């Protein structure tokens, strides 16, 4: 419900739920979701100084306490979103690339495509959208296969026009 509420911009409801979060006894899998829920909520508000200090603590403890690689990936891309949203995604270029080739070997297409969009987004906030259009044109066929990225994929298209 909270995730749907976040999508429909119902900030009041999700805000009230996070209050229950800090004083509930929750399972680990539940804990991560709320932990992941909070960082997404903070992104929408606009404050990124708190979230940035918060996301890194999560992923750092998402690799030592529990070797959950899947939740590590989801947190990493959120940080990527935070940077590029603040007009500085160039810092994330070392981070995005090291994951790309790493997941190319793994072969999970969803991982490969999502980083492509992030790579495309950083290249267009530089002023080198020319090559970004060239890259997205060649890969447009294989990126429409995934539904939930289409909304982001479609939205980027009108930006290029």
């Amino acid at each position: 419900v909270a995730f749907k509420a976040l999508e429909e911009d119902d900030f009041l409801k999700v805000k009230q739920y996070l209050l229950k979060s800090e004083s509930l006894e929750l399972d680990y899998d539940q804990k991560i979701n709320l932990k992941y829920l909070r960082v997404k909520y903070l992104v929408k508000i606009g404050d990124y100084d708190l979230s940035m200090r918060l996301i890194n603590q999560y992923v750092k403890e998402c690799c030592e306490e529990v070797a959950d690689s899947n939740w590590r990936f989801k947190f990493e891309i959120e940080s990527i979103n935070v940077l590029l949203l603040s007009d500085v995604g160039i810092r994330s270029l070392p981070k995005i690339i090291k994951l790309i080739d790493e997941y190319k070997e793994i072969g999970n297409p969803l991982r490969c495509v999502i980083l492509l969009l992030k790579l495309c987004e950083v290249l267009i906030q530089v002023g080198k959208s020319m090559e970004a259009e060239c890259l997205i044109s060649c890969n447009l066929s294989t990126i429409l296969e995934f539904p939930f990225v289409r909304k982001k994929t479609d939205e980027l298209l009108e930006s290029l026009s």
Binding site: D87, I90, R91, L93, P94, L123, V126, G127, K128, E131
Partner: protein, 153 residues
């Protein structure tokens, strides 16, 4: 007396060893000296194996200038080594980022920043970066700001 040995070799007794160092082209060096407080035996008590971290040949490391000496002999050896694997091209993501022309992290960022302004606070910031005591592509930064300040518009 300095004793040079191969990797799978039987070192002498731990109590008589004062320091050991590893040096080889590639992985960055690791040298540990054994003071009176800790012996080699206590250091190796957990295990007789010591691990080493890999160095990285990253495009981002060589933004504009090469701090590396890049000796001709090792460069030829590396190319021969790479060709041995190739015998047994733009297929690497580093070539992709090279093709994108976004190798220089700082130059890219400032070009985005200067796109338009030039507020006094940020203007002094770029000037501070221009007058940095030590950095990399300083001349590139100097020459952008000159283009932004007095170039065609």
């Amino acid at each position: 007396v300095i004793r040079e040995i191969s990797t799978p070799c039987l070192l002498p007794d731990f109590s008589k060893i004062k320091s050991i160092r590893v040096k080889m082209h590639g992985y960055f060096p690791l040298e540990v000296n054994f003071t009176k407080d800790y012996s080699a035996s206590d250091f190796f008590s957990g295990g007789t194996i010591i691990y080493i971290q890999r160095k990285s040949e990253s495009v981002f490391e060589n933004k504009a200038s090469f701090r590396n000496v890049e000796d001709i002999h090792v460069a030829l050896k590396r190319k021969a080594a790479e060709s041995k694997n190739y015998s047994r091209g733009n297929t690497t993501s580093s070539q992709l980022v090279e093709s994108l022309g976004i190798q220089d992290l700082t130059m890219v960022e400032l070009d985005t920043l200067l796109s338009a302004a030039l507020t006094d606070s940020e203007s002094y910031n770029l000037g501070l970066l221009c007058s940095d005591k030590n950095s990399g592509d300083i001349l590139d930064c100097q020459l952008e700001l000159w283009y932004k300040s007095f170039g065609p518009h």
